[PDB]
Amino acid sequence: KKILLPEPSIRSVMQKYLEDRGEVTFEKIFSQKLGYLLFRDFCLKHLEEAKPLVEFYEEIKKYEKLETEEERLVCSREIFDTYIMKELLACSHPFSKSAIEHVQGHLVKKQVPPDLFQPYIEEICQNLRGDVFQKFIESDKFTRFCQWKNVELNIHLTMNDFSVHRIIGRGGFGEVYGCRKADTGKMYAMKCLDKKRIKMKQGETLALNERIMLSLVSTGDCPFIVCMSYAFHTPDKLSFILDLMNGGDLHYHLSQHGVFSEADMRFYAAEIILGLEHMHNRFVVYRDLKPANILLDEHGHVRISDLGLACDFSKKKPHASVGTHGYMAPEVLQKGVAYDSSADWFSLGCMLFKLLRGHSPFRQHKTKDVELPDSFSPELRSLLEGLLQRDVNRRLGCLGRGAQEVKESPFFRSLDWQMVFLQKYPPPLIPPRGDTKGIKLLDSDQELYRNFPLTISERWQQEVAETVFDTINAETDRLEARKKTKNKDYALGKDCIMHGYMSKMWQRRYFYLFPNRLEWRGEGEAPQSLLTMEEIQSVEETQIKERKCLLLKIRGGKQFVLQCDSDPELVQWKKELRDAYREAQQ
RNA sequence: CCAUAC
Ligand SMILES: [Mg+2]
Secondary structure: OOOOOOOOOHHHHHHHHHHHOOOOOHHHHHHOHHHHHHHHHHHOOOOOOOHHHHHHHHHHHHHHOOOOHHHHHHHHHHHHHHHHHOOOOOOOOOOOHHHHHHHHHHHHOOOOOOOOOHHHHHHHHHHHHHHHHHHHHOOHHHHHHHHHHHHHHOOOOOOOOEEEEEEOOOEOOEEEEEEEEOOOOOEEEEEEEEHHHHHHOOOHHHHHHHHHHHHHHOOOOOOOEOOEEEEEEOOOEEEEEEEOOOOOEHHHHHHHHOOOOHHHHHHHHHHHHHHHHHHHHOOEEOOOOOOOOEEEOOOOOEEEOOOOOOEEOOOOOOOOOOOOHHHOOOOOOOOOOOOOOHHHHHHHHHHHHHHHOOOOOOOOOOOOOOOOOOOOOHHHHHHHHHHOOOOOOOOOOOOOOOHHHHHOOHHHOOOOHHHHHHOOOOOOOOOOOOOOOOOOOOOOHHHHHOOOOOEOHHHHHHHHHOOOHHHHHHHHHHHHHHHHHHHOOOOOOOOOOEEEEEOOOOOOEEEEEOOOOEEEEOOOOOOOEOOOHHHEEEEEOOOOOOOOEEEEEEOOOOEEEEEEOOHHHHHHHHHHHHHHHHHHOO
C-alpha cells in the first residue's frame, strides 16, 4: 500500500515540467505545504547561514495564535531578546531600523497584537527568495520535493485504493459510504453517485455541477465546509472523496437536546457564517441551508453538507426555485426572477430561528380572517429581523459587504471572529458514542465524464504531510543511501536538454536528449545507440492499451514506440522532443 | 410525487 517514491533521476524531466509551469518560484514552493516542510527540513538541518531566519519565523507563527493577551506579553519578550536583540548587537542583520522602531514602538506601550511582526515576516521572505532559494533548488531536499510532486500528478484512483467499511446514506443517485484511503490510511466519507441512475433522471447536469462546486469551495483552508479531496470515476460510478463527519446532523441533535439556548446556538450561527462567507467569496449559493445539511464531528464543530443544490452566480444569476421548502427566500420563489447570496442569509435566519424554537416561519396561506415571540433578548431580535426582511436590499449580508455586515451585529457584541475561525470557542454540545437493470452504459455519453477526476493539491499534500511524509522520507533516504555505496553523469560539459526513463520493442533504458541527437544506454555501459532529430517526422501519442505512450515516425520509415512511467514524464517528453527536431531541421 | 451522510 505504502506510496513508494520515484528515483532521483526524475529531477531532470520534472524540473523541465515545473519550470514551464512557473512553479520554480519561492512563492508557490513556499505556499505549498510539502515544499515548505522540505524548506525547513532543508535549512534547519543543512545550510547554516539561513537557520535563524526560519527559527525566528517559525516562532512568530507559533506566537501569532496565543489565546490570551498575556501569553503574548510573555512571548513578545522571548522573541525580541533571542532572535532580534541577541543578533542585533552581534551584527547578524541585513534588516532595517524602522522594522524595529515600529516593533519596539508597539512593544514599548505594553501592546501585543497578533499581526505585529508581519513587517518582519515580509522582509524575511526577501532574504530567502534571493540567494538561499537558489541553493535550495539545487539539493537532495529539492530532489526530494520533485519526487513527491511526481506522485501528486500520478495519483489516479480505483476501488482498491480505498478500504471501504460502512454505508450511511441512500438518495437520488448515490449512497454515502465510509472508507479509509489505502495509500496513507486517511478517513474519508465516500459519496458514490451511479451513472445509470444519473442517466435515467437526466441529472448528469447536477452530478457534473456538484464536482465543480465541490472543486471551487474546497480550496482555501476552510473548517466549516465538508470539502472534497479527490474525484474519480469507474466504468459506472462517480466518486467524491469528502471529509468524514461522525456526530450525526443538527436535526437529530435538535431532537435530543430539544430547543437550544441563545448563547449555545450563537456558536453554530458563527461557524456557519464563516462557511457561508467562503462560498460568497467564490460566488456560490448553498440555497439549501438547514440543520440536516449541517453535520458535526467528534469534537463538536460543524460543517455544511450537501453542496448538490448549490449554484455559481459569478457569471449568470440563477432564477430557479430551488431549496428545502422551509427556508426558501422571497427572491427564489418566482418565475423568471433571479437571486444571489441573499437567499443564504434568509435561510440562515429561518434556520437559527428554528434552532431556538422549532416553529415554522413561512408558508403560503395568509390574507384576512415575521412577528416574533417574547423569549428573546433585543440583541437576538435585532439580528433575525434584519436577516429575515421580506425584501432584497432591506436585509443583512446584502447592501454592502456580504458576510461582514452579518458579523458586525450586536448579538456578536461579545465574540472574536478570528478565534472562531481557529475553533477556540467551546462547543455547546458534544455528541454521543455511535432496480436499474434495463439501462446500458453508452460510451458515446461517457465522453462528458472526461476530466471528471480531480486530485486537489492542497488537500493531498496536507493529507500526506499529516501522516506518512516524514517516515517515508527516511524510507527512500535509506534506499538512496543503501544504493549509492552499492555502485561505487555523461551530461554536463556539452549541451543537453533532458534525461529520464522509458522503453521500446519491454526494455527499460536511460535516455539523454540533445539538440541534434538522442543517445541511450544500459546501466553498466556508454551510449549504446542513437537517433537523430533530422530524421524524425511525426511525433504523436497513441495511448494504446489504456496506457499513455508516444508514437515516433522516422524518415527511414519504421514507427517507434515509447512508454513512460508517469504521465508528467510523457507530457514533458512529448513537448521537448517536438521542440528539438522542428528547429533542428531548420 | 420529491428528498435523502436528514
Ligand atoms: Mg443531494
